[PDB]
Design a protein around this ligand. Sequence first.
Ligand SMILES: Nc1ncnc2c1ncn2[C@@H]1O[C@H](COP(=O)(O)O)[C@@H](O)[C@H]1O
Ligand SMILES: Nc1ncnc2c1ncn2[C@@H]1O[C@H](COP(=O)(O)O)[C@@H](O)[C@H]1O
Ligand SMILES: [Zn+2]
Ligand SMILES: [Zn+2]
Lengths: 200, 200
Amino acid sequence: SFRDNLKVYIESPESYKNVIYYDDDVVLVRDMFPKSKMHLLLMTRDPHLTHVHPLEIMMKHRSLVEKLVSYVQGDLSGLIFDEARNCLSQQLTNEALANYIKVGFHAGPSMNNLHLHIMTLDHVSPSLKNSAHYISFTSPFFVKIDTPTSNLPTRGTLTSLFQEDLKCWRCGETFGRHFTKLKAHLQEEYDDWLDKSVSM
Amino acid sequence: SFRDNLKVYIESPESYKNVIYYDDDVVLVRDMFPKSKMHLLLMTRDPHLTHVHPLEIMMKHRSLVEKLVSYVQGDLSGLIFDEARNCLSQQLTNEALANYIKVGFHAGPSMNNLHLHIMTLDHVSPSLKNSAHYISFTSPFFVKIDTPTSNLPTRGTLTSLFQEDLKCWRCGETFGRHFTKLKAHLQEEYDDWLDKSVSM
DNA sequence: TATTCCGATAGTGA
DNA sequence: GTCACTATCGGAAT
Ligand SMILES: Nc1ncnc2c1ncn2[C@@H]1O[C@H](COP(=O)(O)O)[C@@H](O)[C@H]1O
Ligand SMILES: Nc1ncnc2c1ncn2[C@@H]1O[C@H](COP(=O)(O)O)[C@@H](O)[C@H]1O
Ligand SMILES: [Zn+2]
Ligand SMILES: [Zn+2]
C-alpha cells in the first residue's frame, strides 16, 4: 500500500541519505514532496506507536509528545536550523527562524506511520500543487504539537474545511478557489518576509 | 461580436470558397467547425428574417420554411449528396445518404444570423470536442425542419438537457459524462454503418 | 486530507 | 447551446 511508504525510514534509516537523524527511538527525514521551503518529518520507530492515530497520540500519549518536542527543541534544534538556513537563507538567525517554523500532525494522515511535520511557514514550493495541500497545513486540520488536549479536533470531522475559500496565512487576503493566484501571492509574501527579516 | 460571425456569408458570399451555393435569397456554406463528417449551414439572406429566432421562424414563417426545404430537396440536393460522398464515401448512394442526413435549427443558437444545419448523423469529427456539442444535435434542442409546430420546444427552456448523461444516437448505449469514450464509440458506429451501407 | 495521469468542468476573453 | 485558453475539479491506479 502507498499508505505504508514511510515505513522504510523507521525500519532502515541507514539506507537513506535524506534521513538527517536517527537513533533507536526516532527518525528525522526530509519530506519527499515539501509543501514549504523546509519540510521535515519526525517519526517514532516504536512498532506500536507508529500505528497509533495522531489525535490519540496527542490525547493519551503525552510522554511521546513530550519526547518529540524535546528532540525538536533540543538535540535536533541545531540540525533543523541549518536545514532551514539552507532551504531559505543563511542570513536568517535562529530567532527569526523559530518564529517561521511550525510543528504539528495532520488530523487525518494519508500515510499510516506516525509522522510529525516540521516545516517553515512560507508554503513556497513546487510540490504545493493544490488547494487541499495548502489548507491541510494552515487550518485546524494541522494540529500543532502544543495544542491543549481539550482543544483537539475530533477524528474524522474536518472534511468540510477543504471546500472553503483560500486565505493567505500571513496577511489574510482571500483568493476564492484561485489556487494559482494564491501561489503567486505566497511567493511575494515570502520575498517580503525575507527582506524584512534579514534587514532587522 | 462573435455572434455576428456568420453575417459575412450572406453579405459577401462571393468572397468565400466554402460558400458552395448562393443566390439572391440563400447561401449554403460549410460549417467551419463541423460536428459531423458533413456539416453545412443554409442561411437566408433576407435582412429581416436573418435576425428572427429559429423557433419564431418555425412557428410563423412557414413560407420560408417551405422555401428552405425546397432548396434542400431540390436545387441543392445533388450538391449536398456530392458533399456527403466526399466527406464520407464515394460508395454511398443517394438513398443511403438521405437516411443519414438531418436538417434542423438549434433551439438556442449562438450565432445571430438564421442558419439551418444540414449534416450527416455520424458525429465523427475533430471539431466535436465536448458533451454540449453532441447533445445540442441529438436532443430536442435540435429542432428538425419537419417538426410540427405544435411540437416545438419553448424558447429558453432546454438548459437542463446539457447536464444529462451521454447516449449514443444509433444504438442507445449510455456513457455517463465520459465524452472521450462516447467519441471512440461514435467512430466504431460509423465504421459499422459504412461497412453495412456499402455492402449492398 | 500520498502522487500522477487523464479527462470533465468552469470562467474568460474575443 | 461560437472557439480557445487556462485552471480547477474529479475519479482511478499505484
Ligand atoms: N516516499 C516518501 N518519502 C518521504 N515523504 C513522503 C513520501 N511519500 C509521501 N511523503 C510525504 O508524507 C507526508 C504525508 O503526511 P500526511 O498527509 O500527514 O499523511 C506528505 O507531506 C508527503 O509529502
Ligand atoms: N466563422 C465561421 N464560419 C462558419 N461556421 C461557423 C463559424 N463560426 C462558428 N460556426 C459554426 O456555426 C454554428 C453555430 O450554430 P448555432 O449553435 O445554431 O448558433 C456552429 O455549428 C459553428 O460550428
Ligand atoms: Zn498575504
Ligand atoms: Zn452506439
